[model samples]
Structure formats: structure tokens, C-alpha cells
Target: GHMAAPVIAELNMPRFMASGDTSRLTLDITNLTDKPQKLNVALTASGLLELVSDSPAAVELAPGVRTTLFIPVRALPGYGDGEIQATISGLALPGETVADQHKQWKIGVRPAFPAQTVNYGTALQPGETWAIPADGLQNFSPVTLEGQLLLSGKPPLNIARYIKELKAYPYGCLEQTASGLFPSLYTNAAQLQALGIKGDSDEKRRASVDIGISRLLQMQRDNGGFALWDKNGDEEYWLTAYVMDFLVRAGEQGYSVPTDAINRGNERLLRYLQDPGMMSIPYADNLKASKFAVQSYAALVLARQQKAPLGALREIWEHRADAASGLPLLQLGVALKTMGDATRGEEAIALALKTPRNSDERIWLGDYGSSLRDNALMLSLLEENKLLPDEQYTLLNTLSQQAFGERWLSTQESNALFLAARTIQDLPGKWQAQTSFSAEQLTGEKAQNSNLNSDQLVTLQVSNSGDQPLWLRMDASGYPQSAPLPANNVLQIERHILGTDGKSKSLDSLRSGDLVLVWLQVKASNSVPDALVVDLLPAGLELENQNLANGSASLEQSGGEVQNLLNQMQQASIKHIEFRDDRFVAAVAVDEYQPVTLVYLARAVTPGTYQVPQPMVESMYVPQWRATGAAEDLLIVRP
Candidate 1:
């Protein structure tokens, strides 16, 4: 009778924190018997806790059924040590009486916070400042600071926030994740310039620029050529040039940049300029056009630093100017101007401004489209040369007219926004708004796959790569849109927010840099199939269990392979599972996230040696992937 008794499968109880702290203590009771059982359950707690809810005194469970009961408990105002005990007993059947199950667990209560004293500060004046405990004021004017005007008055403009936002995007570069050092370095230089110009006498702003410079220095390879993503010993000439240009700009602004770093980078750029194959682009594809634009930046750096002569770079650009558009044109203008050809440079600048502006397109420096970055760079050049103040103002207003949504178009656009904001503040101008907010979609993915007929586990994670806080929202829809709507009913999804303890967490308990795992258990149902089959058999032909004797069983496969190449690359984890007929028999089911092992006990009618077929395994997650095992020989015992 004890062998068939009901048992405790699970127990969930939470610790107490204060007098009013309450938690529902749940118990899972599983009946391990062949017949239905009437279970009488009861719970009691130490004096520190009080039962506040009605307890289920009796539960009638079907054979092999598991049922849960939740008992709510609350901590007494001044309660100390505490624990809970759950008891379960079943009614007797004839001469057999099931044994009672008992479980005991301890509880913890935390002391409430004690009262404390605080200090006071001087009253705020209209033009003074005070340092808050947690937040430091940067770029805030004496007017805003004195009046405590962050909430009331139109605050002084701050591009530092935008610069911080730019740094928060995941990738170093403005392009996609795999995109290399050029866009990243360009934005870094832009940020350094903005900080230097608008940072004023703020030490915080200066320190941020120093951090950006250090990041640029880290990207520098041994030969001085900046590589994208990783330094794999291959040097790209235009990339080196772009990097040198930024370093030179930083050095111009009195930031500390290693002299050797600049020398090696300049040498690398020169070597690439000497290589005709690297610079020539008969039909400029997007990549080639970008290369030309970067090459022009290299030439501009060479001319500005007086390290090398333009050396036919001017003639090359003069010829290509007709064919060039966007960033390349802007680069050409910058190069020509640095080399003392202001007329052609201004002409190029005029053409550069005429490039079609699209809000949706990502702003690249010398590209043919108009982005805030392109406009910012164009304005700064005009401002430097004193070419057209009126035109610069018009373009500034034109670029400023654009608005950004909650998310940035790209990392570079954020940098571009900072530059534009800083430039507007520097020049004598009045703008309606000085600051805007935006977020970058951080990189995150599912870690595993779910299986058919059993529960599968999945983890979706997001980490904030930017500096500012974001209210991150993860909306996970398990259903595949392309699959039939009927397939949705095939699996049941359970979502849980996991805490550091690996237990479920509250839904709103997420913050920046927090690794949130949205654990999903997708259980596949055997009854989901539309039709059933019944094999006609002679009466009393014995079967071991009610489950099918030779039914299909699925186990998750090693990796999932979706049809799309980009999606395949982006997916963090992929799993496949399935089933097959014939050569495989005595089928067993397994989940992709769960592994199972089996021990077989066999007997022969007569004493003999038996040969057993090896197990063949497949997945319900992805049916195409599988594995098969070898056969084994065993000696059987006869009784």
C-alpha cells in the first residue's frame, strides 16, 4: 500500500520580508497508483506565519493524475523563526491503505528598514548650481543650474546625451554588425569633434571623448591599419586612411593620441594610395563607392597633415567628380579644399547639398543620399571655409527639419545627430528644440528549440549596449506566420521571466545591462493530430502499455536550418527533431532541450542469447535531421 501512495512532486514557498508579506505555498501531489485515489491534504505553519486562504481538504485524483493545491500564507507583524509542513493521505481501498506524504520547509523574514536622518542644502538661485548625489550636471548653463530649471525652464542644449546614445549601439560601426572600422571610426571622430566643440569646460565631456579615443586606439592593428571587427593581420588601405583622419582631428583638438599610431596609419594609407588596384573603381558598386569616399578622406588627411602631396589624387577626383555622388562627392570636396582648391571644393559642396534627402536611409559621410550625418559634415565644412553662411543656415534648418522616431535608423545617425546639434549650438542660431531621444535595437536571440509531444526550453536575451536607460520590451510570438494556422494548436507555450536564482521573476523586473531570459516551454500534444488509427487485433493479444507499441517518437536535432541565409546567420540557436518508420521500432519520444536514457530488462521463454536492434533517433522539431545506433547482443534469462 505504501508503494502505491501519493507523493509530493513539487513544493513552492516564498520567503517573508515584512509584517504584511504574503505568499501562496503550492504543492503538487502525484498519485502513483493504477486506481483513482481520494487524497486528503492539509498544511500548517509555525507561529510566525498564518494561513489566510481556504485549504483543499480533499482531492479526488484519477489514476496517474497529478493535482496542485495552493495555500496562502502571511507573516505576523513581529514573527521571527518560521516553517511550513504539508501532509497528504489517501483513503483505503479494501485491505490496502495508502501511506501519508509529509514535507517540511523553512521560511525567512527580513527586518524592516529603520528610520534615519538627512541633511539640507542651500536654496537654489536663478543662476547658481548644486551637485546632486547621483547625477552630475554637464553642459547645463548657470541659468538652468541656479534656477533648478531642468523641469521648468527651457534647459540649456546638451549634445553629450546624444553622444552617449551613439556609444550605446551594439556594433562599433554605424552599418550592420559585421560592418568594419570605417563607419565606427568616422562616428568616433564626429563624437570627439562634437565633444571638443560643445563640451565647453566640462571635465565629464572631456573624459568621454578620451574614452572614445582609447576605443579607436584599440581598433588599430600592428601595421597601423584599422581593421573591422577583429585584427586578423590583413590591412585595408582606405580603412587606415579613415582612421588616420579621425586621429588627426582628435590631436587637433588637444586630445592625447599616440604619435606612432598616427605615423603607422598614415604609412598604411599611403601604401594603399600607391596601389592602383585598390583605388580604381570602373563601375562603383556600393562597396566600391564607399571605398572611394574613404580614399578621398585619406587624401584629405595627407594634405591637411602636410605628410604627403596630393599626388594625382586631385586629378583622380577631378575626373571622378562628374561620376561621383553622395559621400564620395563630399569627400572629394573636403580633399580638394584641404589641398587649396576652394572653388572646386565649394562646387562639389553645392552638388553634395543637392543630393536627395530621405529620412529612412542611413546617413553615410560621402554617400549620394542626404542624411543628418551628411548634412552635418557638409555644414561644418562650409562653416570652416566661410563659403555660404546663408546656404549653411538653410541646409542646417533643412536637416534639422527631419525628426527621428523612438529608434535610430543606424548607429551613425545618432553620431550625426550629435554633430548637427553641437554645430547648431556653436553657430549663432535659434532652434525650436535642442535634444531628442532614440534607442538602438540591441542584438539578442533564442538559445534553443522545442520538441514535439514533450516540453522544450528556449531562452531569449537582450542586453543594453548603449549608455542611457531603455524600457525594453520583448514580444515573443512562437507561432510561425508562414506555417498553417492549424499548426498553432500543435504546441502549448509557457513563458517565464527567470531571475538570477534561476526561478521565475516578475514581468516588470528588467533594467539596462540585465540579462533577461524569457524561458519558454513548448509542449507538443499527441492528440493534436487530426486523425487516429486503430490496428485490428485478436482479443487477448497482450500489449505492455496503452501508448502505441510502434508509434513515432521525436527528439530535437543538433541545429536548426531555416531557409533564409541572413536569418540563419542571425539565429543564435537552431534545433531539429522528428520521427521515421520501418528500420526503427519500439519508438520513444524525446525533447530537443531534454535528453533521456533508458535501461532495458528483457527475458526469453527459453534460456538463449538475444540480438537487439540499436535505437534510431530523429526529431519532431526538425524531421530531416537524425542519427542511428548499432545493434547489441545480450544474454536473456528465462523464468
Candidate 2:
């Protein structure tokens, strides 16, 4: 290395700081010449990290002498990457040819932990005051708001987002397999174009429907029943009824359902309902209710085929109290309406509505069941009877709001909702919305859940062109400047950092270049057949995954009680590991009453203080069943 450079500089500073915090760094300046020289220095920084220092701006140095200057810095209100720059310029002392000296330091500032989240929505009337609340927000870079305003009493189907969600819905079983095609059946070409599916919407629908039909055909059982698996193992009674019902409707909706497939799946339904005494296995606890649902749904399908099972319907009606409210009740109501029993049907539906656990506002099925199918049954039933126009509109409101104007998960749920939405689309509607929103100038058939200005508080001042109210859902997500995130989950998780030699290492004692193993332990309530373990690495730690090719791995639970919870949780295995830029995710399985320990290697990189985000583990499918670790603060020093 040459030793005659005019000026040289280095900064001893933390690589990170919390927004709105204060810290200090040092600027070391050296003179490399043989004579004395005076230098002019300028220190500058902007954005989240502002320089608030009285460091030296002018200095006289002897040849080959170095000097250290102290500088105070403050983080501004915001989050993300920022930096400081120091530049020196002076006369190129005796025989020095260098023009200038420059140095820069990078800093990554973070918002507070356990960020604040906003998810607000309701019915807004004309001239109503809808306000969003936020306090002490200095910078909004990290905040995000996704909201929508649509006409009330209308089916708000954000067809675009619904289509996007379709690709990801789970479709592992026969019911789900047939459920996947209902959305395409419900969404027409013109509606698709209106929702921005501009390219060959009809062609896409037809092609997708045909492909789905082929798949459904494959899942049909040879014994005239639709198999849960693709091949014929058994003829599930209620399942056969559910799939047969979809086919009958698909045939009416301009999709060609093979007559043989329908006949065979239907024959299985008819044959099963004819006996009803021999249906066996696993219905011991709730045998009466289970038989009631099977009989009620099976009768409904038979009615749809122009063959009303009067005796079977009579039998169900006689034992009506055994039917779960909103369960086979709606199915029974719809079947009676399909048959010529208008007066009886009216009373049956009245009982369906009068039951607890379901209202005009909410419908469910099981102990409580799928509102998708429940709503679908109610919509078709009410549309047929036109008995309660007001009730029908209220049901419509429930349907639209449940979807949140975006999309719903699960093929079973989404498909049923789409079918429900279509049954009433053609029913004459006089309601429309022309309202102004706070975020964007959106006025059309519908403006779905969209990302607007996520960083700021939002309010909506709407003037409804029509008399009906409008439904709105504005969802905002982000963290604060610096607050501690707490554990808010059903399951439990804890994290620790250790050296490769299995010794514990606190983040407070970490240094750059030190390789550490991150150990995460999670405990679950029961055996979680599927779940995810997610950890957000602190900014200073870089994951060491040299052997994790393709950045993913299927780590089996060889699948936790912290010590006994550990044993219970470990019954399941981690099926996948994906290393991304900001977080590491592991798809894991959990055994009932077990615990699991997941470990990975990471090396300390930047020297700074960091907020170690709370690690989490949650069910992949169910909304419930989740756990979070405690948040942590970390510090690493330069080696």
C-alpha cells in the first residue's frame, strides 16, 4: 500500500439505530504528507438519519499525524436505509496531487417493533363522518393502506382479485375439486372485462372450465360415487350429494357435464339414500345429526334433478329438530322450494332463519359450517321465493362483506360464494354507488381492496349518488417508530442464539464475523398437520446456508414439551425451508402435545443495534393456531 496519500478517513459508528433515537460516531482523519496542512471538512446527512453533530470543520495537522473527532447523530422519524457523508478539501499540500478525500457510512434505521395495524370498515351513509386515526407519525414510508368503497346492499365481487386468489385456493379433495370451477361459471365475459380481465375472458373461462371438468371426471368413482381421492376407494354419502349438486347446476349454467358422470355420481346418491340404515363409520357421537345432514342434502340434490324424494323429505321434516340450525335446515328449505311444497317450504325456511348461530348478517355450517355454502343455499332459496326482498338484500350485504371485496381462501368457500353471487346477479337491482374516496378517484362498477397511500392516516368523505349506503373496508399495516411487539398467538415460541459449539451467545455480546446458530423452539396445542415457522432475522445477522441449495429444504420433525411440550411439538417435521431477503420461513408439521426445535446458522455482518423481531409459528390452513416469541434487542460490534 502506498503511504503518501494526501488525506484518509474512517468512521467508527453503529450501522443501525431506532428511528427518533440519538447516538454518536467518530471521524478519524489522517494527514499523509511531510509538511503541515490545514484541511476544511464538511459532514452531511439527510432523510431518516440526520447529522446533529459539532464535529471539527477545520483542522491543522502535522505531517503523518492523525486526529479523531467526535460527532453526535440523531435518527429522524421514519424507517429504512440512510447514510452520512464526510468530505474533505484543501490545498494539495507540498507535492501532494490528490484533489479531495471522501468517506461514507451506511445506517439502517427501523421503525418500532410490533407495528400498529389498521383494519376498519363499515356501512357509511351519505354525509357520514369516517375518520382514520394515527398519532405522531413523522414519516410514512413503512405504513401501507389497502381499502375499498362500494355501494351498500350490493354484491361486491372484486373479480380481478378473486381470479388472482383462485390460483392459490386449496383443492385437495373431491368437493374442492368441483368447487374450483364455480367462479369461472359465475364470472361472465363482460363482467370479466369490466373487472380488468381484458384478454379473452370468455376463452379463459371456457378453457379453465373444460380443464376442471376433465379433472372432475377423473375423480369420479366407478361405483357411481365421486371419490375423495382421484380413484374409487369409497362412496362418501354427503360428499356424493355435494358434487352431484354442483354438476346439476353446472349443466344449467351452460357448461357441459357428461351425462354419464352425472348419472353415475347421482345413482350413488340415490342408492345411498334409498337405504340410509347401513351408512357406517365415525358417526357414533353425532349419528342422528350426521344422518340428518346427509339425508337433507341428498334430498335437495334429488329435487334439483326433477325427481323430488317426497318420502325422504317427509322423513327429514318429521325429524327436523335433529337437523343442525343453518345446517341441513337451509338444504331442507331449498329442497322443499325446488319441489312443489311452497307453503311447507315457507315454514321450513322460516325455521332456518329463526335459528341461533345464523342470522341475515351471518350464515354458517358443521357445528357452525361454511357460510359460503350456507349463503349460497339461502340466496338461491330466497331468490326462488322472493319472500323477503329486504332479507335477500341483507344476505347480499353479508356475502359481499365476508369476501372483503377481494377474495376468500379455500376452494370450498370461494366457489360456493361465487355460485351464491351469481344466483342473484340477474335479480333486478336498482341500487348503485357514486361516492368519492379519500385516497383515489375511483368510481365504477366497483373499486376493490387496493393499495393506496399506506403511509398516512385516511378518511373517506363520500356523497352517495343514490339512496343506498356503501360498504367500505380500509386495511392498513405497518410498525410504529419504536414500540415493543408482544406475543399475541395461540401457540408459543422462543428464540436463542448460540455458537456453533452449542454454547449460548447473547446478541448484546455479538461481534461482526461471528457465526452463530439460531435456535427456535415452538409449542402447539395439538398435532398441527401443517404449519409455518417464520423468523425475521435482525439486520445484523446474515443467514449462513451454504448447503441449502435452491434456498429451500424440507426439514422433517425427526418432527416438542419446551422439554415435554418440545416432545409433543416435534411429532411433526419441517417440510420446507425458504431463505428470503428479510425473513426465513419453514413449513413444519406438529404432533399433538409436542414441541419442536428448529436451528439454522447465521453470521453477524453489520455492527449496530437492531430489533430482533418476534419469531412466529402458525397454521398454514386454519386462521387460528399460532404462536409468537418475545421481541429482542441486539448489538454487534466491528471485529
Per-model TM-score on C-alpha atoms: 0.41, 0.56
lDDT of 2 by residue, 1-639 (tens): 332347778887654566655555677788777666677778888667777755465687788899977677776655577788887876555555443778778887764353443445566564454555445233234432233333334445443444534544533456656666666766677776554444456777788887887787787777777665556445567777877777787778878877888777777666655767776524224566667777777878888786757666766787778765464776777777788776667677778766543333111122223445466556666776566677777777777666652321444455555556556544333343433344333344434433444433443444444455555555444555443445544567888876665567777767777876677877765655446787877666777663232222223232221233223334446556666545677777565465777766677775555656778787543434677677655454444
Could you give candidate 1's per-residue lDDT for residues 1-639 as a string of tens digits? 444665555665532333344554567777777777787777787756777776676788877888877666665544255777777777776766575788777765422221111111222223333333222222222211211111111112234334444443433421222122222333444445534323223455466667676776676777677654346533445546655766787677777887787788887666654554554322233444456566666666787786545655655465454433454566667767777777777676677667644343222223322355566566666666566677776775555444222222234444445555545543321111111121433221211111111011011222323232211111111211111111123233323334333454443322322332222223333311111111111111111221111221121121131112123222312211111111112223333343332211111121112222223333221221233232222212221
Candidate 2: where is the Cα deviation over 4 Å? 1-119, 135-147, 152-164, 170-177, 196-200, 216-239, 254-260, 275-285, 337-344, 358-376, 384-390, 397-411, 423-639
lDDT agreement with native, every candidate? 0.42, 0.60
Please estimate how well model 1 matches the true structure, expressed as its whole-model Cα lDDT: 0.42
In terms of lDDT, which candidate is strongest? Answer: 2
Q: What's the true lDDT of residue 118 in model 1?
A: 15
Q: Least accurate stretch of 10 residues (summed lDDT) in model 2?
A: 359-368
Model 1 quality (TM-score): 0.41
